[PDB]
């Protein structure tokens, strides 16, 4: 019932920057509010307890402030390890409730992807399905357009993308696009192409292959 509203829901900041994440509950909760840090596949960690109290192992850059209906988590000199999703939690009424979360990512300079195309495997081909894969490696920002072209015809609805989380060392993203087709249809076409548009590319980059020709 106590509804926990966090702001913003996502943010990108430079290393050394001061980040501020805000939390407002639906009613006054005094100082019964805690802040957690959550990294994918890791155990949540309580950073601030009761509005303002640092926990053991938590760097002094982390600070919590506020009371009643307004709370603020401050991270003063953002570091790469601070990449995570942050959550406020109210402990005032029986159903404990969390804010929706605030994802913190690292702002960095534009970086163009390196692009690679992979034809389906002969092993795969023996099973009646063909997967063609396109790789966009180590780019920033995350936004990219990847179009599949088969014999110069634009595809749609037959591909799926997946993106990695921001790299720890270079703050880049990597991305795959997989085109799925029947073997029968794969064998009716020759030119398979992955075309990539990204802010770091001065014009689109196309990687392509000719079925049968290595």
């Amino acid at each position: 019932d106590i509804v926990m509203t966090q702001s913003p829901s996502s943010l990108s900041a430079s290393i050394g920057d001061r980040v501020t994440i805000t939390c407002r509950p639906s009613q006054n909760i005094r100082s019964f509010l805690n802040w957690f840090q959550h990294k994918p596949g890791k155990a949540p960690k309580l950073l601030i307890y009761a509005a303002s109290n640092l926990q053991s192992g938590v760097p002094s850059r982390f600070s919590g402030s506020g009371s009643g209906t307004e709370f603020t988590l401050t991270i003063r000199s953002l570091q790469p390890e601070d990449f995570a999703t942050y959550y406020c939690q109210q402990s005032y009424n029986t159903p404990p409730t969390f804010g929706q979360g605030t994802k913190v990512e690292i702002k960095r300079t534009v970086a163009a992807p390196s692009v690679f195309i992979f034809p389906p495997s002969d092993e795969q081909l023996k099973s009646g399905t063909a997967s063609v894969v396109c790789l966009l490696n180590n780019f920033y920002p995350r936004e990219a357009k990847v179009q599949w072209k088969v014999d110069n015809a634009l595809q749609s609805g037959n591909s799926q993308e997946s993106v990695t989380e921001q790299d720890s060392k270079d703050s880049t993203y990597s991305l795959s696009s997989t085109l799925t087709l029947s073997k029968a249809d794969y064998e009716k076409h020759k030119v398979y192409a992955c075309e990539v548009t990204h802010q770091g590319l001065s014009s689109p980059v196309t990687k392509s292959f000719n079925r049968g020709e290595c």
């Binding site: 805690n34 155990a43 960690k45 309580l46 009761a50 926990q55 402990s91 005032y92 404990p96 795969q124």
Partner: peptide, 30 residues
């Protein structure tokens, strides 16, 4: 500083639970 039983402060890493009627199946690797 907390209402009763309302401030978990040492958590595990978690475990994924999928609910569907679908069947287990292993992957092919290419």
């Amino acid at each position: 500083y907390c209402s009763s039983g309302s401030c978990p402060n040492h958590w595990g890493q978690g475990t994924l639970v999928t609910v569907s009627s679908a069947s287990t199946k292993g992957p092919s690797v290419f």
